[PDB]
Amino acid sequence: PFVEDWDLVQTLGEGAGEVQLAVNRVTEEAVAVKIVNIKKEICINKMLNHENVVKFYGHRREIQYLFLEYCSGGELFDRIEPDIGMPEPDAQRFFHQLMAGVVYLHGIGITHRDIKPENLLLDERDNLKISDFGLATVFRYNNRERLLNKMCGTLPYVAPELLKRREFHAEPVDVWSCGIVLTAMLAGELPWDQPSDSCQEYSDWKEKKTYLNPWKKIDSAPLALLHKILVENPSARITIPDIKKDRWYNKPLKKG
Numbered sequence: 001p002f003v004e005d006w007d008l009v010q011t012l013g014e015g016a017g018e019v020q021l022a023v024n025r026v027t028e029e030a031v032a033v034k035i036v037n038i039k040k041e042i043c044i045n046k047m048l049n050h051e052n053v054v055k056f057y058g059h060r061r062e063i064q065y066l067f068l069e070y071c072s073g074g075e076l077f078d079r080i081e082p083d084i085g086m087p088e089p090d091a092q093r094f095f096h097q098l099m100a101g102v103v104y105l106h107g108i109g110i111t112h113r114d115i116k117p118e119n120l121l122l123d124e125r126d127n128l129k130i131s132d133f134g135l136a137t138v139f140r141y142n143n144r145e146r147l148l149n150k151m152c153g154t155l156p157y158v159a160p161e162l163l164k165r166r167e168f169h170a171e172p173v174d175v176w177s178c179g180i181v182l183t184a185m186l187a188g189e190l191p192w193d194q195p196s197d198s199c200q201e202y203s204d205w206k207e208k209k210t211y212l213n214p215w216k217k218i219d220s221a222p223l224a225l226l227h228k229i230l231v232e233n234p235s236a237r238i239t240i241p242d243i244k245k246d247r248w249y250n251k252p253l254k255k256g
């Protein structure tokens, strides 16, 4: 066990330390407790205020204890059936929410840098919340953008420029990773280990061999969006404002 007025029940997961479920045995309030960038993660977390971003309640040192909004729905990762994905209507809804969360972060000059299904949680209402800001950083301050120069993230989810460029813009990288997540949601598999020239799967994609997995499992509509997101040249890659105007993005979907 317990921290101050909170008792720790179970180990909900773990980064990397351990994420525990805490209950204010008195007020019965339930929140997530993460046990331990760290300094920056807290600083960044303190700026976060959005319905699609895990809320930060506070921290305590004592090993720093981060108190976060509890998402009982777990990771989006576990809603993805291997080799199958999930119903398109569910995928679209999660993607809508992911975009809302990313737009917000980018609007406050914050880049997540580690968007993946393991870092996207769901509340009791199955609302998506962006989580795990341990790799996040500021890319815009005083209205002045700063290019990124460090390589952070998770290989299957990183944009190709991150592996080939000295410096790169932060936004297009987060957008790319969102497209990898969309791919996973609709195909139940990742398209490649990494977006490098030495990767057969990536080369096949650039060569537009969509008759191969996982592209063949994806409907033409969402697939056309993926064609705009997973663009090698970050300056040609689709932006969020344009994603929001995409045909599939705006397609009414019914399940079942």
Ligand SMILES: NC(=O)c1ncc(N[C@H]2CCCNC2)c2nc(-c3ccc(Cl)cc3)cn12
Binding pocket: 012, 013, 014, 015, 019, 032, 054, 068, 069, 070, 071, 072, 073, 074, 075, 118, 119, 121, 131, 132
């Ligand atoms: N803020 C939360 O709530 C929360 N934060 C982080 C979690 N795990 C990390 C682990 C490392 C990768 N990123 C996610 C996590 N797992 C659950 C959960 C909820 C319900 C079930 Cl059934 C299982 C896990 C809830 N959370």
